[PDB]
Amino acid sequence: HWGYGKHNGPEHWHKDFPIAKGERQSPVDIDTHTAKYDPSLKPLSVSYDQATSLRILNNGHSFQVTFDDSQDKAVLKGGPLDGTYRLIQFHFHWGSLDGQGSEHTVDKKKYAAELHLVHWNTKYGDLGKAVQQPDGLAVLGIFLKVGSAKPGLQKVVDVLDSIKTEGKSADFTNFDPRGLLPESLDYWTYPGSLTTPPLLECVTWIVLKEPISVSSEQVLKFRKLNFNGEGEPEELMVDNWRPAQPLKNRQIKASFK
Ligand SMILES: NS(=O)(=O)c1nnc(-c2ccccc2Cl)s1
Ligand SMILES: [Zn+2]
């Protein structure tokens, strides 16, 4: 029932998911001046060399690329994290125009889109168990701005026409997510939540300072996807982002000066 429209969007979510008004909700505005540099923070460790992508899927709210998470093949650790987190999927949030689309904001600035690489803490055995724990997930967030193309994103955008509508999926093997990372792994981090229902407060957010650049043609292909299923009135999948939520009792830490 939930979505991003006037009658079922983010302002409505608390009715089915009361935690929407909780104490550690995401996304948030990252005030860069107030975020404190924490010299105790370690470099992020991103080990994606053995990543195995499986399928790409339009789930009615975004599109996602899903990985084999049955072994430690693609893992996140270090940074603010204790232990090892397995990559299960990545997806995007984007706007109807280039001046909006990201979920997190930086000094109130919105990016055209935001990439989320979702990982779960292996000590909990599976994603379903992990989301019920305050340190169950680590989501790596990467901003997208419009300019030069990102060659590593092209194999993704070229297949989107085959998953136009809700519930469509396709084989998507041998995709290398290293091709979506910016040069620097400098990051902000804070305790937060899933940004879609069920909005569980299970996420250590790690948001990279450096955005990746994608081309207008690449983002344009995102905007041709549909929220609706095949045979329903066509509603473009655009503006599938939750706005910034109250920071409340939280400190955002920076890994860099
Ligand atoms: N946008 S996000 O990465 O915070 C995210 N929000 N919800 C996610 C989710 C929802 C339902 C089941 C499993 C997952 Cl991983 S992932
Ligand atoms: Zn997301």
User: What is the 3-class SS of the chain, one letter each residue?
Assistant: CCCCCCCCCCCCHHHCCHHHHCCCCCCCEECCCCCEECCCCCCEEEECCCCCEEEEEECCCCEEEEECCCCCCCEEEECCCCCCEEEEEEEEEECCCCCCCCCCEECCECCCEEEEEEEEEHHHCCHHHHCCCCCCEEEEEEEEEECCCCHHHHHHHCCHHHCCCCCCEEECCCCCHHHHCCCCCCEEEEEECCCCCCCCCCEEEEEECCCEEECHHHHHHHCCCECCCCCCCCCECCCCCCCCCCCCCCCCEECCC
- 38: tokens are 């924490």
Neighbouring residues of 109: CB distance < 8 A, sequence distance ≥ 6 = none
Query: For the stretch 130-160, what's the b/e string if a residue is b when 16 or more beta carbons lie within 10 angstroms of its beta carbon?
Result: bbeeebbbbbbbbbbbbeeebebbbbbbebb
Question: How far is ligand 1, taken at its centre, from the CA of residue 202, in Å?
Answer: 10
- 221: tokens are 């292909």
- Sign of torsion, CA 132 134 136 140? positive
> Cβ(28)–Cβ(190) under 8 Å?
yes
**Dist. CA 61–CA 67, nearest whole Å:** 19
Neighbouring residues of 164: CB distance < 8 A, sequence distance ≥ 6 = 58, 224, 225, 226, 230
Nearest to 109 by CA among 154, 145, 64, 72: 145
Q: Which residues surround ligand 2, an ion (CB under 5 A)?
A: 116
> Cβ(111)–Cβ(99) under 8 Å?
no
- Sign of torsion, CA 144 148 152 158? positive
- The catalytically annotated residue of 1, 7, 14, 61 is 61
**195 pocket-lining for ligand 1 (C-beta < 6 Å):** yes
State the residue range of the domain holding 186: 1-257
Domain with residue 55: its CATH number is: 3.10.200.10
Would the annotation count 7 as a binding residue?
Answer: no
Experimental determination technique: X-ray
Place of tokens 């990467």: 142
**199 pocket-lining for ligand 1 (C-beta < 6 Å):** no
**196 pocket-lining for ligand 1 (C-beta < 6 Å):** yes
> Cβ(70)–Cβ(52) under 8 Å?
no
Resolution expressed in Å: 1.8
**Dist. CA 105–CA 63, nearest whole Å:** 21
- 220: tokens are 């344009």
> How many structural domains does the chain have?
1
- 84: tokens are 């090892």
Phi, psi of 123 (to 5 degrees): -70, -15
Q: Return the HEC string of 157-209.
A: HCCHHHCCCCCCEEECCCCCHHHHCCCCCCEEEEEECCCCCCCCCCEEEEEEC
C-alpha distances out from residue 9 to 14, 67, 70, Å: 10, 28, 34
61 catalytic, yes or no? yes
